[PDB]
Structure 1
């Protein structure tokens, strides 16, 4: 991310059969698979680089990433159940208490007597 937060994203997608399809299966050629995989990697890389993790997490909740993947990869081959399967945090930079407080939105004591 822009915060120097190194992370690993896993995406999963499945082919679907058209409305008027008659074939039992909906397999895609390996050329389509490689084409779809390239598009997905571009979108995942683009969003993470141009966003903070707090921004990235804000994207995960509404699943806007999946809808973006749908439209981009759609012309290649119809797809279903597009999701960001997993997110890992490989490395962290130096901890910043100031940034942490801002994300969460000091206190005097009471005289003991």
Structure 2
């Protein structure tokens, strides 16, 4: 990430059938599945390197990355369920009280005698 975090993201997807279809299955072939995995990997790495971790969390809040994947891989194959399954940490940066506190939004006591 741009704030030096190392992250691993697992994303899953599902094919769907058109309404006009009468075939009871809509599989995708090998060039299809390979191109699909490629373009979703592209949008994944591109967006996580265009954003920070804070904005990344607020980006995964509305699941607008999956809507982006749909409206980007729309020109390959019809999909019904697209999801990011997993997010795992690998290496954490060095802690900054500044970053954590400026995210979160200096104290005095009561004079014990």
Whether the TM-score (by the shorter chain) exceeds 0.5 is yes
Residue 71 of structure 1: how far off its partner (Å): 1.0
Residue 80 of structure 1: how far off its partner (Å): 1.4
Q: Deviations over 1:55-76 (max 9, x none)?
A: 1001001001000111111110
Partner SS for 1:59:
helix
Matched pairs, number? 113
Residue 42 of structure 1: how far off its partner (Å): 0.4
Residue 90 of structure 1: how far off its partner (Å): 0.7
Partner SS for 2:51:
coil
Gaps of 5+ in 2: none
Residue 20 of structure 1: how far off its partner (Å): 0.9
The whole-number CA distance in structure 2 between the counterparts of 1:94 and 1:30 is 43
Gaps of 5+ in 1: none
Residue 84 of structure 1: how far off its partner (Å): 1.0
Alpha-carbon RMSD: 0.7
The whole-number CA distance in structure 2 between the counterparts of 1:78 and 1:107 is 58
Residue 51 of structure 1: how far off its partner (Å): 0.9
Partner SS for 1:81:
strand
TM-score for both structures, normalised by structure 1? 0.97
Q: How does 1:11-26 map to 2 (within 5 A)?
A: 11-26=11-26
